[PDB]
């Protein structure tokens with residue numbers, strides 16, 4: 658199916674109100690309207706998120722709104738055995754980290770996803786099924802991969818059956834929200850700006866046919882990606898190549914060229930090869946600032962978001978034969 662695209666407009670901050678910077682971003686349903694400072698440009702997306710102001714009430718509603726629309730679906734995708742990915746893209750200060758991680762007072766997607774994950778595994782585990790949860794957390798800076806849960810820099814390779822992976826990146830089993838919160842909290846403290854963070858959850862769902870004792874695995878993966886600022890040769894390579902990737906895959910999603918998609922020209926696009934054009938259910942959250950002083954970066958974000966929704970993915974359930982048979986036998990009962 659198509660890459661899902663959401664656009665999130667952060668509200669006017671105090672500086673923009675104090676200095677009379679004009680608000681140029683309007684939203685109506687799932688349409689974004691960019692006004693000039695010379696015709697109104699209208700973009701259409703799957704979802705649009707916006708807030709009336711920065712009050713606690715509106716911010717609480719905003720984070721809940723994003724999770725209700727994107728968080729639940731990606732959680733469900735992982736429980737159905739899909740690789741799923743949310744990546745936030747946009748100018749610095751537009752809301753990428755606020756959306757993906759949030760703050761202590763305003764938790765974002767990742768805290769809610771981790772809470773819902775363990776809520777669900779602990780609710781659903783029974784004689785017919787169990788769940789294993791493993792997390793990795795890594796950062797891409799200057800085309801180098803650092804392990805945030807810890808071999809000073811790690812190499813990307815791609816296996817013909819396993820896909821791209823980070824050689825030597827720790828993958829830690831977790832059994833509760835507090836385990837994973839403590840890991841993400843220490844990863845969060847180990848950052849380095851123009852870097853990309855990737856939070857990866859692997860959900861292994863073992864199904865058991867109690868009559869036979871046969872068992873099988875269905876593996877879901879969550880990739881929660883908080884990219885570097887889109888406004889910005891090594892240090893920009895991943896960001897620049899993602900633009901080309903999105904453009905090339907978007908052309909193919911229609912009928913232009915037929916089109917060098919340069920996945921392996923950067924660490925970021927190589928590790929996201931499946932997330933874009935491959936075996937994944939993927940959502941983009943494009944974050945934009947609302948006011949006149951960012952009109953141009955906003956337009957550029959809106960445009961890449963506009964192309965990204967023409968990208969075609971081919972997601973399959975990642976399960977062994979026993980898991981598929983045992984699962985179907987359970988859906989029949």
Ligand SMILES: Nc1ncnc2c1ncn2[C@@H]1O[C@H](COP(=O)(O)OP(=O)(O)NP(=O)(O)O)[C@@H](O)[C@H]1O
Pocket residue numbers: 665666667668708711716719747748749750751752753754755756850884885886887944
């Ligand atoms: N949707 C939102 N609603 C309310 N406030 C927001 C929202 N998005 C961002 N903010 C505010 O904007 C500030 C900057 O957001 P932030 O998520 O750090 O941007 P960023 O895209 O990650 N910048 P950068 O890491 O430098 O590329 C935060 O302190 C929030 O107060």
Ligand SMILES: [Mg+2]
Pocket residue numbers: 753754755
């Ligand atoms: Mg950030």
